[PDB]
Amino acid sequence: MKLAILGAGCYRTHAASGITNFSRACEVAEMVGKPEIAMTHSTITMGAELKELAGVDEVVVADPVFDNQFTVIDDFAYEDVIEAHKEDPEKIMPQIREKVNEVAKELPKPPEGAIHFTHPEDLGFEITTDDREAVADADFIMTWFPKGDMQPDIINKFIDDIKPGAIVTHACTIPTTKFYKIFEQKHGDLVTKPETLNVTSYHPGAVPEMKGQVYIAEGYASEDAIETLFELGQKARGNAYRLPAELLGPVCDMCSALTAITYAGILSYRDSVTQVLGAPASFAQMMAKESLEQITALMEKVGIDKMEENLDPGALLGTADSMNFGASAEILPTVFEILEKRKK
């Protein structure tokens, strides 16, 4: 099958963040015996994995940067990188960071400049500057575009060239519904039928060269298209997660912490009620819904910064202690210490 990668990515913000490495990229370099994979990033890593682990035959990358200032940094041997990532990546990440930052001081931002350590040509990818050319006959279009208002402008060029029923994906840079609405603008066209498109995500939830994982939004694509993507993603990325589009943000953005805490709570609370009190799941859910909705309404009513002045965190200490059994016993003692520090 034909995969069109639209957007190669730039390394500058990964380096500037100060906290990323190539753990995943190094990992798959070893898996396939190809050291140059070790220093791929972004969409080039994910393309390497789909070609070399999932068996996707043809891969094109389209980016205007190729014909502009596409810089490959050849300072670091692939093998020294692969090496340091066995023991400790922080032996080598600082200098890589340092070098990228110096080059990024003067280099224009994408699509005028981009920083890479392995050229996608060395990986056996077709490279192109024409989006429209890249998407003709693609079954799987992986978009990786800048955040904000340029995406509709970028997409509207090649949307008519998109093969009917193709899988079309986005990453961290746009929410699914906003990505969908761009295709939805054109629903009614009989010649290519964009209503037949399977719109979803291939969102890494982290820089792809660092963590082997992908997140696949459900709600727009057909079930078949989701299963296929999930299968490819499981083989390519190692860990795949399919989930409602409406939960992609809550799961992947800064609020992931709150979504984790709350979901752990719900599951633990549910199990304590069904296993220990022996009530039906519905009784748990009816209690949980009122509890979730009301704490949420409080926050909205008074402001997240003013909740304590309205609900003393200590209020929960002398009531929740009697729910400290079953699966809730795993989390409640940690919650009591927190509530304890914050009580009036």
Ligand X SMILES: C=Nc1ccc2ccccc2c1
Closest approach, Cβ 231 to a copy of itself, in A, equals: 15
Q: Of the candidates 172, 229, 245, 251, which one interacts with ligand X according to CB under 6 A?
A: 172
CB distance 98 to 42 below 8 Å: no
Give the residue among 154, 108, 123 at the shortest CA–CA distance from 60. 123
Q: Of the candidates 191, 305, 322, 341, which one interacts with ligand X according to CB under 6 A?
A: 322
**What per-residue string of b and e applies to 274-301 under the rule 16 or more CB within 10 Å gives b?**
beeeeeeeeebeeeeeeeeeeeeeeeee
Q: Which residue has the tokens 């995500």?
A: 201
Please tell me whether residue 206 binds ligand X under the rule CB under 6 A: yes
Give whichever of 1 and 311 is closer to a copy of itself, judged by the CB atom: 311
> What character string, x for contact with ligand X (CB under 6 A) and - otherwise, covers 221-260?
-------------------------------xx-------
Give the residue among 66, 210, 188 at the shortest CA–CA distance from 125. 66
Contact region with a copy of itself (CB under 8 A), list: 66-74, 133-141, 163-171, 263-271: 263-271
CA gap 274, 322 in Å, rounded: 16
CA gap 306, 313 in Å, rounded: 12
Closest approach, Cβ 304 to ligand X, in A, equals: 21
Give whichever of 59 and 284 is closer to a copy of itself, judged by the CB atom: 284
Q: How many chain residues are in contact with a copy of itself, going by CB under 8 A?
A: 86
Q: Of the candidates 1, 107, 247, 276, which one interacts with a copy of itself according to CB under 8 A?
A: 247
Q: Which of residues 277-306 bind a copy of itself (CB under 8 A)?
A: 277, 281-282, 284-285, 287-301, 303-305
Q: Where are the beta strands (DSSP E) in the chain?
A: 2-6, 58-62, 69-72, 113-116, 126-128, 140-143, 167-170, 198-201, 214-218, 240-244
CA angle (146, 148, 151) in 5-degree steps: 65
Please give the backbone phi and psi of residue 126, each rounded to the nearest 5 degrees, phi first: -60, 135
Q: Which of residues 188-207 bind a copy of itself (CB under 8 A)?
A: 205-206
Give whichever of 34 and 203 is closer to a copy of itself, judged by the CB atom: 203
Closest approach, Cβ 35 to a copy of itself, in A, equals: 25
CA gap 44, 171 in Å, rounded: 14
Q: Of the candidates 91, 109, 181, 342, which one interacts with a copy of itself according to CB under 8 A?
A: 342
Please tell me whether residue 282 binds ligand X under the rule CB under 6 A: no
Please give the backbone phi and psi of residue 195, each rounded to the nearest 5 degrees, phi first: -65, -20
Contact region with ligand X (CB under 6 A), list: 122-130, 199-207, 213-221, 257-265: 199-207
The residue ranges that bind ligand X (CB under 6 A) are: 172, 205-207, 252-253, 319, 322
